[PDB]
Known about the structure:
Two copies of one chain form a homodimer. By secondary structure, chain A is mainly β.
Amino acid sequence: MIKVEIKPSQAQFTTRSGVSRQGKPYSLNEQLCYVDLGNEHPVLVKITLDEGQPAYAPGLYTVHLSSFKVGQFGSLMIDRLRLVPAK
Amino acid sequence: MIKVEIKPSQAQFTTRSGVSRQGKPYSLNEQLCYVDLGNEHPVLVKITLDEGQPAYAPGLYTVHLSSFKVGQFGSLMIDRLRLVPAK
C-alpha cells in the first residue's frame, strides 16, 4: 500500500528485447511510474509487464500485495509491480 | 498495511556465519515473523538483522517504507525489512 502515479507522459510502455535456450526468450517491456516512498518527493520506478498484460492507463494506483513474494532463502520481495485503482 | 507479527516463540534470532566468495566475513542474524500478504493464511518470513540490532519483541507490527530502495533502471527492491510498531 504505496502511492503509485502514472502521469499521461508514461502511458506507453518501453522495450528491451531477447533470447535463451530450451524455450526462454527475454523480449522485455517496461512502463514507468512515480512512487512516493513516504518522502514529499516522487521516485521514477519501473514496472515490468508480463506477456498479454498491458500498460496501465494514466492515473493513481496503489501497490497490490501480490506484487510481493517469498524467495529462495526465505526473504520477502517485490517480484513484480502490481497495481490497483483502490480508493 | 504490510501487516506483520512476531509471536512469543519467534521473538529472537539465529546467527549464521562463514565466508563470502570475495573471502569476506559474515555473521548474519535472522528472525521469523508472520507476514500478511493476503493469500488466506499467514506466510512465514525471515528478517535479516543489522549489525548490533536486537531481534524485535512480540507483537503486532507493520513494515516501514525505509525497507524499499531503488536503483539501476528505476528498479524497486526491498533492501532490509524494517518493521515499526502498530498504531
